[PDB]
Short mmCIF file of C-alpha atoms and ligand atoms in Angstrom, two decimals:
data_model
loop_
_atom_site.label_atom_id
_atom_site.label_comp_id
_atom_site.label_asym_id
_atom_site.label_seq_id
_atom_site.Cartn_x
_atom_site.Cartn_y
_atom_site.Cartn_z
CA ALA A 531 18.33 3.86 8.60
CA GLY A 532 15.75 0.06 8.39
CA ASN A 533 16.17 -3.63 7.09
CA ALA A 534 15.12 -4.44 3.64
CA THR A 535 11.88 -6.76 3.14
CA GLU A 536 11.34 -7.17 0.00
CA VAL A 537 12.77 -7.56 -3.54
CA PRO A 538 12.18 -5.44 -6.65
CA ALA A 539 10.82 -8.35 -8.56
CA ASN A 540 7.60 -7.88 -6.13
CA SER A 541 7.50 -4.19 -6.29
CA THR A 542 4.33 -4.90 -8.87
CA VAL A 543 2.32 -7.12 -7.36
CA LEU A 544 2.59 -6.18 -3.98
CA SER A 545 1.60 -2.75 -4.87
CA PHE A 546 -1.37 -3.72 -6.98
CA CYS A 547 -2.42 -5.85 -3.76
CA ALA A 548 -1.77 -3.21 -1.38
CA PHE A 549 -3.93 -1.10 -2.70
CA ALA A 550 -7.12 -3.02 -3.95
CA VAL A 551 -10.71 -2.96 -2.34
CA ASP A 552 -10.00 -6.81 -2.59
CA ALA A 553 -6.72 -8.46 -2.30
CA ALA A 554 -7.67 -11.81 -3.24
CA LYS A 555 -9.29 -11.02 -6.31
CA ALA A 556 -6.32 -8.66 -7.84
CA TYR A 557 -3.66 -11.43 -7.11
CA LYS A 558 -5.71 -14.26 -8.72
CA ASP A 559 -6.57 -12.22 -11.53
CA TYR A 560 -2.93 -10.21 -11.42
CA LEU A 561 -1.96 -14.37 -12.01
CA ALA A 562 -4.01 -14.80 -14.35
CA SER A 563 -3.16 -11.80 -16.67
CA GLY A 564 -0.17 -13.38 -16.83
CA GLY A 565 1.98 -11.44 -13.60
CA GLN A 566 4.86 -13.82 -12.05
CA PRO A 567 4.45 -15.31 -8.36
CA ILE A 568 5.31 -13.33 -5.80
CA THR A 569 8.74 -15.21 -4.92
CA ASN A 570 11.14 -13.64 -1.68
CA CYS A 571 9.01 -16.79 -0.08
CA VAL A 572 10.95 -18.30 3.40
CA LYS A 573 11.10 -21.91 2.11
CA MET A 574 12.76 -24.43 3.98
CA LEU A 575 15.76 -26.58 4.24
CA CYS A 576 13.60 -29.68 5.78
CA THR A 577 14.14 -33.23 5.63
CA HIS A 578 11.30 -34.82 4.13
CA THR A 579 10.20 -37.42 6.48
CA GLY A 580 7.26 -35.41 8.17
CA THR A 581 4.03 -35.53 8.61
CA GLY A 582 2.77 -34.67 5.31
CA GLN A 583 0.56 -32.31 7.32
CA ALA A 584 -0.85 -28.79 5.76
CA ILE A 585 -0.26 -26.19 8.73
CA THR A 586 2.21 -26.98 11.61
CA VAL A 587 4.16 -26.02 13.94
CA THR A 588 7.54 -27.29 12.88
CA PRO A 589 8.23 -28.21 9.07
CA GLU A 590 6.56 -31.45 7.98
CA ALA A 591 6.72 -31.28 4.33
CA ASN A 592 7.18 -35.18 2.97
CA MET A 593 8.96 -36.15 -0.67
CA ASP A 594 6.08 -34.68 -2.46
CA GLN A 595 6.00 -31.60 -0.79
CA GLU A 596 8.22 -28.26 0.58
CA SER A 597 7.93 -26.64 3.67
CA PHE A 598 7.72 -22.60 4.22
CA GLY A 599 7.39 -19.98 6.95
CA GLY A 600 3.67 -19.31 7.57
CA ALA A 601 3.72 -15.55 7.18
CA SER A 602 5.68 -15.90 3.93
CA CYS A 603 3.18 -17.70 2.17
CA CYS A 604 0.35 -14.87 3.78
CA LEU A 605 -1.00 -12.33 0.95
CA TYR A 606 -2.30 -10.52 3.68
CA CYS A 607 1.28 -10.30 5.63
CA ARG A 608 2.53 -10.20 2.42
CA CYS A 609 1.53 -6.70 1.80
CA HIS A 610 0.80 -5.33 5.29
CA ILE A 611 -3.43 -5.40 4.70
CA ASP A 612 -5.97 -6.84 7.02
CA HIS A 613 -7.07 -10.02 7.06
CA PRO A 614 -10.09 -11.45 5.79
CA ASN A 615 -11.06 -12.83 9.23
CA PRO A 616 -13.88 -11.48 11.68
CA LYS A 617 -10.98 -11.11 14.40
CA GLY A 618 -8.00 -9.68 11.68
CA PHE A 619 -6.15 -12.84 12.59
CA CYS A 620 -3.76 -14.85 10.53
CA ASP A 621 -3.72 -18.59 10.33
CA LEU A 622 -0.61 -19.40 8.88
CA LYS A 623 2.13 -16.38 10.55
CA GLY A 624 4.00 -18.68 12.99
CA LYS A 625 3.38 -22.06 11.39
CA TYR A 626 4.85 -24.44 8.50
CA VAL A 627 2.82 -24.40 5.54
CA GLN A 628 3.34 -27.74 3.64
CA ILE A 629 3.32 -27.18 -0.39
CA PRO A 630 3.08 -29.76 -3.24
CA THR A 631 6.96 -29.70 -4.86
CA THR A 632 4.29 -28.88 -7.52
CA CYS A 633 3.07 -26.22 -6.44
CA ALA A 634 5.63 -24.48 -4.81
CA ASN A 635 6.33 -22.03 -7.67
CA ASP A 636 3.87 -19.91 -6.31
CA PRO A 637 3.11 -20.70 -2.41
CA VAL A 638 1.04 -17.97 -1.70
CA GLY A 639 -1.40 -18.30 -4.77
CA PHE A 640 -1.67 -21.64 -3.31
CA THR A 641 -2.54 -20.86 -0.09
CA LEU A 642 -5.59 -18.34 -1.30
CA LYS A 643 -6.84 -21.33 -3.76
CA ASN A 644 -6.59 -24.20 -1.25
CA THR A 645 -8.46 -25.36 1.98
CA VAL A 646 -7.00 -27.44 4.71
CA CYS A 647 -8.98 -30.68 6.01
CA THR A 648 -9.78 -29.86 9.52
CA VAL A 649 -10.17 -33.57 10.69
CA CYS A 650 -6.95 -35.45 8.56
CA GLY A 651 -5.05 -31.91 8.64
CA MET A 652 -4.01 -32.49 4.40
CA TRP A 653 -4.91 -30.60 1.80
CA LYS A 654 -7.86 -31.03 0.08
CA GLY A 655 -6.98 -32.59 -2.93
CA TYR A 656 -3.34 -32.15 -1.70
CA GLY A 657 -3.07 -35.49 0.88
CA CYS A 658 -6.56 -35.38 2.30
CA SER A 659 -8.08 -39.15 1.74
CA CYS A 660 -11.30 -38.13 3.70
CA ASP A 661 -14.37 -40.45 3.06
CA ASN B 1012 18.88 -5.81 -5.11
CA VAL B 1013 16.47 -4.25 -2.79
CA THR B 1014 13.66 -1.93 -2.49
CA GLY B 1015 12.63 0.30 -0.21
CA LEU B 1016 9.19 -0.73 0.10
CA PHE B 1017 8.12 -2.74 3.20
CA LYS B 1018 11.33 -1.83 4.82
CA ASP B 1019 11.47 -2.78 8.72
CA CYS B 1020 12.34 -0.15 10.23
CA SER B 1021 12.49 -0.75 13.79
CA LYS B 1022 15.27 -1.16 16.31
CA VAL B 1023 15.49 -4.56 16.91
CA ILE B 1024 18.66 -5.95 15.61
CA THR B 1025 17.87 -9.11 14.92
CA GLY B 1026 14.48 -11.72 14.04
CA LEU B 1027 12.47 -12.91 13.03
CA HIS B 1028 11.66 -16.23 13.54
CA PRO B 1029 11.39 -17.82 10.22
CA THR B 1030 7.25 -18.44 10.61
CA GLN B 1031 6.91 -15.21 11.23
CA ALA B 1032 9.16 -13.13 8.42
CA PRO B 1033 7.28 -11.82 5.62
CA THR B 1034 9.93 -12.76 3.37
CA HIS B 1035 13.25 -15.00 3.50
CA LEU B 1036 15.52 -11.54 3.56
CA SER B 1037 13.66 -10.66 7.06
CA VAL B 1038 14.56 -13.70 8.39
CA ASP B 1039 17.25 -13.55 11.19
CA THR B 1040 20.64 -15.05 10.39
CA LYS B 1041 20.54 -17.54 12.89
CA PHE B 1042 18.41 -19.27 10.40
CA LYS B 1043 19.77 -19.05 6.78
CA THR B 1044 22.09 -21.51 5.54
CA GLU B 1045 22.66 -22.08 1.71
CA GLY B 1046 20.17 -20.08 0.65
CA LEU B 1047 17.53 -21.62 2.11
CA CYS B 1048 16.40 -21.64 6.12
CA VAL B 1049 16.03 -23.98 8.76
CA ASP B 1050 14.00 -24.11 12.05
CA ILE B 1051 15.86 -24.69 15.07
CA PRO B 1052 13.90 -26.40 18.09
CA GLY B 1053 14.47 -24.06 20.99
CA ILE B 1054 14.91 -20.54 19.58
CA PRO B 1055 11.47 -19.54 19.94
CA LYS B 1056 8.88 -17.18 18.01
CA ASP B 1057 8.60 -13.54 18.88
CA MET B 1058 5.15 -13.11 20.65
CA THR B 1059 5.43 -9.02 21.70
CA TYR B 1060 7.25 -7.31 18.85
CA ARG B 1061 5.66 -4.40 16.93
CA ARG B 1062 7.73 -4.00 13.54
CA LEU B 1063 7.40 -0.81 11.27
CA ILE B 1064 7.08 -1.47 7.99
CA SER B 1065 7.62 1.42 5.61
CA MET B 1066 4.82 2.33 2.56
CA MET B 1067 7.27 4.40 0.67
CA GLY B 1068 8.50 2.57 -2.58
CA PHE B 1069 4.79 1.92 -4.45
CA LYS B 1070 5.02 0.99 -7.81
CA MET B 1071 1.61 1.54 -9.83
CA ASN B 1072 2.94 -0.45 -12.84
CA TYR B 1073 0.29 -2.96 -13.23
CA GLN B 1074 -1.16 -4.42 -16.20
CA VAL B 1075 -4.32 -6.44 -15.50
CA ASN B 1076 -7.10 -6.65 -18.13
CA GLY B 1077 -10.15 -4.49 -16.65
CA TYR B 1078 -8.32 -2.66 -13.77
CA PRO B 1079 -7.36 1.04 -14.84
CA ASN B 1080 -4.05 2.37 -14.55
CA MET B 1081 -3.80 4.86 -12.16
CA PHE B 1082 -0.95 7.02 -13.98
CA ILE B 1083 -1.99 8.53 -17.31
CA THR B 1084 -0.81 9.56 -19.78
CA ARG B 1085 -0.36 13.63 -20.53
CA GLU B 1086 -2.58 13.72 -23.82
CA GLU B 1087 -6.05 11.73 -21.43
CA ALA B 1088 -4.53 14.50 -18.34
CA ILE B 1089 -5.43 17.01 -21.15
CA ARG B 1090 -8.52 15.30 -22.51
CA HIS B 1091 -9.58 15.55 -18.46
CA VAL B 1092 -8.19 19.23 -17.60
CA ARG B 1093 -11.79 19.18 -15.78
CA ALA B 1094 -11.37 16.86 -13.08
CA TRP B 1095 -7.99 18.11 -12.04
CA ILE B 1096 -7.25 18.96 -8.21
CA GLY B 1097 -3.57 20.13 -7.39
CA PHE B 1098 -2.02 17.16 -4.54
CA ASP B 1099 0.47 17.75 -2.04
CA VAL B 1100 1.97 16.00 1.45
CA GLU B 1101 3.87 17.22 4.30
CA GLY B 1102 5.60 14.29 6.29
CA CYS B 1103 6.88 13.73 9.92
CA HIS B 1104 9.54 11.27 10.54
CA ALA B 1105 9.31 8.20 12.19
CA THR B 1106 11.03 8.26 15.54
CA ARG B 1107 11.91 7.15 18.97
CA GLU B 1108 10.59 3.44 18.63
CA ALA B 1109 11.00 3.11 14.74
CA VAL B 1110 13.54 4.91 11.94
CA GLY B 1111 13.54 4.97 8.13
CA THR B 1112 9.91 5.98 7.21
CA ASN B 1113 7.96 9.00 7.17
CA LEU B 1114 3.90 9.46 7.86
CA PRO B 1115 1.30 11.78 5.72
CA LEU B 1116 1.41 14.93 8.33
CA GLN B 1117 -0.31 17.97 6.19
CA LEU B 1118 -2.35 17.26 3.35
CA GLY B 1119 -2.43 19.22 1.11
CA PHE B 1120 -5.12 20.40 -2.68
CA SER B 1121 -5.57 23.35 -5.31
CA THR B 1122 -9.43 23.47 -3.39
CA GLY B 1123 -6.97 25.37 -0.96
CA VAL B 1124 -7.36 22.59 1.89
CA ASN B 1125 -5.39 21.46 4.08
CA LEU B 1126 -6.26 18.58 6.94
CA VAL B 1127 -3.76 17.28 9.82
CA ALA B 1128 -3.82 13.49 10.55
CA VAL B 1129 -2.21 11.92 13.23
CA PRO B 1130 1.03 10.47 12.42
CA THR B 1131 -0.46 7.18 11.64
CA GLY B 1132 1.92 3.82 10.53
CA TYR B 1133 1.62 0.19 9.33
CA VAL B 1134 2.79 -1.53 12.54
CA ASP B 1135 3.33 -5.31 11.88
CA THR B 1136 2.63 -7.90 15.04
CA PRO B 1137 2.80 -11.83 15.30
CA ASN B 1138 -0.98 -11.54 14.22
CA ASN B 1139 -1.29 -9.39 11.96
CA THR B 1140 -0.32 -5.34 10.53
CA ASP B 1141 -1.77 -2.71 12.87
CA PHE B 1142 -2.55 0.07 11.56
CA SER B 1143 -2.04 2.66 14.55
CA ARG B 1144 0.06 5.67 15.69
CA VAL B 1145 3.35 6.34 16.21
CA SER B 1146 6.34 8.37 17.68
CA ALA B 1147 7.20 11.07 15.23
CA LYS B 1148 8.70 14.35 14.54
CA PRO B 1149 8.61 17.17 12.44
CA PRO B 1150 11.86 17.24 9.91
CA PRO B 1151 14.68 18.62 11.23
CA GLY B 1152 14.06 21.46 8.37
CA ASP B 1153 14.39 25.06 9.76
CA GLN B 1154 11.65 25.47 6.97
CA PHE B 1155 9.36 22.90 8.57
CA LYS B 1156 8.81 24.57 11.96
CA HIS B 1157 6.09 25.97 11.25
CA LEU B 1158 5.10 21.73 11.28
CA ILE B 1159 5.86 21.72 14.94
CA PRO B 1160 2.00 22.68 16.00
CA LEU B 1161 0.55 20.72 13.37
CA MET B 1162 2.32 17.48 15.66
CA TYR B 1163 -0.40 17.85 18.29
CA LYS B 1164 -3.66 18.47 16.44
CA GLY B 1165 -3.68 15.99 13.37
CA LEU B 1166 -7.37 13.95 13.22
CA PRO B 1167 -7.35 10.83 13.00
CA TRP B 1168 -7.42 8.79 9.66
CA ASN B 1169 -10.77 7.07 9.30
CA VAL B 1170 -12.35 11.29 9.82
CA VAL B 1171 -9.50 12.53 7.35
CA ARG B 1172 -10.15 9.88 4.87
CA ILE B 1173 -14.24 10.89 5.06
CA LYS B 1174 -13.38 14.82 4.36
CA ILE B 1175 -11.09 14.06 1.73
CA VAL B 1176 -13.76 12.11 -0.17
CA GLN B 1177 -16.28 14.56 0.49
CA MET B 1178 -14.28 17.57 -0.37
CA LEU B 1179 -13.29 16.08 -4.47
CA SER B 1180 -17.24 15.20 -4.09
CA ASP B 1181 -18.22 18.44 -3.23
CA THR B 1182 -15.36 20.18 -5.34
CA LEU B 1183 -16.36 17.42 -8.90
CA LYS B 1184 -19.91 16.48 -8.78
CA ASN B 1185 -20.49 19.31 -11.63
CA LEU B 1186 -17.30 19.10 -13.00
CA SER B 1187 -16.07 15.43 -14.29
CA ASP B 1188 -16.52 11.63 -13.63
CA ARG B 1189 -13.19 10.88 -12.05
CA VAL B 1190 -10.70 13.01 -10.41
CA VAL B 1191 -6.84 13.69 -11.81
CA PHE B 1192 -4.23 14.36 -8.66
CA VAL B 1193 -1.93 16.58 -10.15
CA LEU B 1194 1.49 15.65 -9.06
CA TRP B 1195 5.28 17.35 -8.41
CA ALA B 1196 7.67 14.64 -6.87
CA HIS B 1197 5.04 11.33 -6.83
CA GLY B 1198 6.38 9.28 -4.39
CA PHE B 1199 5.32 11.00 -0.96
CA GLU B 1200 1.70 11.59 -2.27
CA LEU B 1201 1.55 7.48 -3.86
CA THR B 1202 2.47 6.34 -0.10
CA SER B 1203 0.07 9.12 1.46
CA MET B 1204 -2.84 7.63 -1.21
CA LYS B 1205 -2.41 4.19 0.84
CA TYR B 1206 -4.18 5.76 3.73
CA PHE B 1207 -7.27 6.71 1.64
CA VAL B 1208 -7.38 4.92 -2.06
CA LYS B 1209 -8.41 2.15 -3.20
CA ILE B 1210 -8.09 0.39 -6.62
CA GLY B 1211 -9.89 -2.66 -8.69
CA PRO B 1212 -11.92 -2.93 -11.71
CA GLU B 1213 -14.60 -0.11 -12.95
CA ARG B 1214 -18.01 -0.49 -11.00
CA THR B 1215 -20.95 1.49 -10.90
CA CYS B 1216 -22.84 4.03 -8.61
CA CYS B 1217 -25.31 1.96 -6.45
CA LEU B 1218 -27.72 4.93 -6.97
CA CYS B 1219 -27.34 5.91 -10.16
CA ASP B 1220 -25.99 4.16 -13.80
CA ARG B 1221 -22.36 6.99 -13.47
CA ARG B 1222 -19.13 5.68 -12.78
CA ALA B 1223 -17.91 4.62 -9.42
CA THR B 1224 -15.80 7.33 -7.34
CA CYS B 1225 -16.06 6.06 -4.19
CA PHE B 1226 -15.84 3.40 -1.44
CA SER B 1227 -17.18 2.43 1.63
CA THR B 1228 -16.12 -0.11 3.83
CA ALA B 1229 -19.32 0.05 6.67
CA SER B 1230 -21.57 -1.11 3.56
CA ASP B 1231 -19.20 -2.73 0.50
CA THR B 1232 -20.39 -0.48 -1.80
CA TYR B 1233 -19.74 1.94 -4.38
CA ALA B 1234 -20.76 5.92 -5.42
CA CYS B 1235 -20.08 8.51 -7.76
CA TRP B 1236 -18.94 12.04 -6.55
CA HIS B 1237 -23.25 12.24 -6.18
CA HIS B 1238 -23.86 10.01 -4.11
CA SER B 1239 -21.20 9.71 -1.71
CA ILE B 1240 -22.22 10.84 1.80
CA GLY B 1241 -20.26 8.55 4.53
CA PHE B 1242 -17.94 7.32 2.12
CA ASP B 1243 -14.53 6.66 3.16
CA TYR B 1244 -12.12 5.79 0.17
CA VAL B 1245 -11.88 7.29 -3.28
CA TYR B 1246 -12.04 4.50 -5.80
CA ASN B 1247 -10.16 4.80 -8.93
CA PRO B 1248 -8.30 7.64 -8.46
CA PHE B 1249 -5.85 8.72 -11.55
CA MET B 1250 -2.97 10.81 -11.24
CA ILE B 1251 0.20 12.32 -13.24
CA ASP B 1252 3.25 13.43 -12.31
CA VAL B 1253 3.81 17.13 -14.00
CA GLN B 1254 7.60 16.41 -12.63
CA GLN B 1255 8.32 14.19 -15.01
CA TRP B 1256 7.38 16.43 -17.93
CA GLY B 1257 11.21 17.25 -18.39
CA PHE B 1258 11.93 20.23 -16.09
CA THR B 1259 15.24 20.86 -14.49
CA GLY B 1260 14.47 22.54 -10.95
CA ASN B 1261 12.29 22.77 -8.00
CA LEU B 1262 8.31 23.10 -8.08
CA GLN B 1263 8.59 26.81 -7.49
CA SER B 1264 10.98 28.33 -9.80
CA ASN B 1265 9.42 26.33 -12.96
CA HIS B 1266 5.59 27.34 -11.79
CA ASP B 1267 7.07 31.36 -11.32
CA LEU B 1268 8.26 30.95 -14.86
CA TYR B 1269 4.65 31.45 -15.94
CA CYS B 1270 3.06 32.62 -13.08
CA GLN B 1271 3.74 35.61 -10.47
CA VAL B 1272 -0.15 35.44 -8.22
CA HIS B 1273 1.34 32.28 -5.72
CA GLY B 1274 3.76 33.19 -3.93
CA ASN B 1275 5.07 30.91 -1.73
CA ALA B 1276 3.62 30.75 1.78
CA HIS B 1277 5.28 26.88 2.39
CA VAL B 1278 1.89 24.76 3.11
CA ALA B 1279 0.74 21.54 1.31
CA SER B 1280 -1.80 23.18 -0.43
CA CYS B 1281 0.08 26.26 -1.78
CA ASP B 1282 2.74 23.23 -3.19
CA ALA B 1283 -0.80 21.86 -4.81
CA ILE B 1284 -2.15 24.91 -5.86
CA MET B 1285 1.19 25.64 -7.79
CA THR B 1286 1.63 21.65 -9.60
CA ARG B 1287 -1.60 22.41 -10.80
CA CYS B 1288 -1.32 25.79 -12.37
CA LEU B 1289 2.49 25.17 -13.45
CA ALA B 1290 0.31 21.74 -15.39
CA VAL B 1291 -2.52 24.35 -16.60
CA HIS B 1292 0.24 26.24 -17.90
CA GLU B 1293 2.28 24.02 -19.51
CA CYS B 1294 -0.77 22.19 -20.88
CA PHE B 1295 -2.52 24.71 -23.18
CA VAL B 1296 -0.04 27.38 -24.08
CA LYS B 1297 2.33 25.99 -26.38
MG1 MG C 392 5.74 16.01 -3.43
ZN1 ZN C 393 -1.00 -13.59 7.20
ZN1 ZN C 394 -9.08 -34.91 5.19
ZN1 ZN C 395 -24.48 8.43 -8.16
ZN1 ZN C 396 0.36 29.75 -10.33
#
């Protein structure tokens, strides 16, 4: 009974971060000792004629990005643990996340490390042009 | 292939929208085409669902510099026989709103202690994961009858984990700088540890130079067995699975080959007592 959600390749990293006192640090440390990034994400087939923006309600990748379902990007969502917010809610679940194609091999690690410009909606360092 | 870890135990037939699915596998079939997913304007998100996520299938084989390993060799368990605590958990089956996973009901230790928990599981919502009570029933086992009155008799997990840290600290403060849980068929005991174990790099107690064995969520601090009052998490425990030493039968039949003074009273602590006792006989005789 029930419907499987995960694949054997993610068991190690999902189990490690599911027990960690500090999941974000655990995943970065896990990546730093050569673990492979979390796979089985929700990759979108889209036109790549979108605004290029970071977090959106419909897929918005341009020609240098991939679009992903946002929850599949949320570490907290992938491990089913508490979210670091005071109110405990996720900013990515229910949205689409645009990831640079060069970083598309690790969507979960990208969003852990990066931040979105609240003025232009672009990733800082990967699209934000703000002075 | 697939794994059973984080299996979706809800009884909803569809689900879910690409923006809400944690994985590609759990995306609803309508959105799937050629190994990818498409967004479909007009098919809206689900903003009311509650989806029990299974915690059966944990694999502790990480190899990360500076993070101790929970599962230890027989030889290192022998060096730390003073830290040995038998541990067994009887569970209940999720029911009604969800089916396909088990939840910790009675936790037994070789100290003789049994703690009964409210059936609590991990439920995905459109927002987060809600650690909350769920519908559950005792196993159809005829021998699982003793579990029936336990269903209305468990404590909330925030109390249960307090009493665990509290019992391990009083038992082990003058014996060891760690705990080694001694198990038989570790699967569901490791699942139960999700409810009260945290792991990370080695730390030191805030009130001493001793190794940290406990952790407090309320204060974000670490403690040894001596200075753990109020702490709710066992930190960096160790453990070993006796069953994996090449035994053939069940727990009792193997325990009974060396010991005749631990009759089976079928409680979680009785299994835990028999597991530690078997480990002692197997490891220190020939
Ligand atoms: Mg067992
Ligand atoms: Zn999330
Ligand atoms: Zn900007
Ligand atoms: Zn101390
Ligand atoms: Zn015995």
